[PDB]
Design a protein around this ligand. Structure first.
Ligand SMILES: Cc1nc2ccccn2c1C(=O)NCC(C)C
Ligand SMILES: [Cl-]
Ligand SMILES: [Cl-]
Length: 182
């Protein structure tokens, strides 16, 4: 109903259409990416500095760290939105790695439509300190995008890219894409 064909447009990058959205996966360092939104996978305190979250907060800088801890004290949040600091993005959306990954990605997509943003980059949310299993994470991320497209919600969002630090986790995402292809 929604899925195109898996191909490789550039070395180490694999992509397929999901409705009107280009879905891409690659291995590498997420802090080197440019997108309207970059997603951080953190703790329920929004102050984790381990693995991908260490790289994101160190490269974003101390003003972003401070914005996180100010919002965390204000109310109980499922996720928080900050500026991008010294990352190449307009906003960082910090999601809780231990939460339901489908729910987290659905929230990211909705917030990007509210801002008329076109591009998103995320890590393999929950596979670091939260220790969620990589094929459950892949299934949940791609399911969230399919649901968003099925509801007719994709308008401004055009590109969703997962940049994955371990090549072995990239292999799991690729297999999940191939299972779905038209
Ligand atoms: C070493 C490292 N550099 C980067 C840069 C980008 C994202 C994460 N990392 C890591 C990371 O995830 N370390 C945990 C483990 C594999 C040692
Ligand atoms: Cl995590
Ligand atoms: Cl990752």
């Amino acid at each position: 109903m929604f899925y195109g064909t898996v191909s490789s447009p550039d070395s180490g990058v694999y992509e397929m259409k999901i409705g009107s959205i280009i879905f891409q996966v690659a291995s590498g360092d997420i802090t080197k990416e440019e997108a309207d939104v970059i997603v951080n996978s953190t703790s329920n305190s929004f102050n984790l500095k381990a693995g991908v979250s260490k790289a994101i907060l160190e490269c974003a800088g101390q003003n972003v760290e401070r914005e996180c801890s100010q919002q965390a004290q204000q109310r109980k949040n499922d996720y928080i939105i900050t500026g991008g600091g010294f990352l190449r993005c307009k906003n960082i959306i910090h999601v809780i790695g231990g939460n339901d990954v489908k729910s987290s990605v659905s929230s990211v997509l909705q917030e990007c439509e509210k801002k008329n943003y076109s591009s998103i980059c995320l890590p393999a949310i929950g596979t670091g300190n939260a220790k969620q299993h990589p094929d459950k994470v892949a299934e949940a991320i791609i399911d969230a995008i399919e649901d968003f497209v099925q509801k007719g919600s994709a308008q401004s969002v055009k590109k969703v890219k997962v940049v994955i630090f371990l090549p072995q986790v990239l292999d799991v995402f690729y297999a999940n894409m191939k299972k779905r292809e038209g």
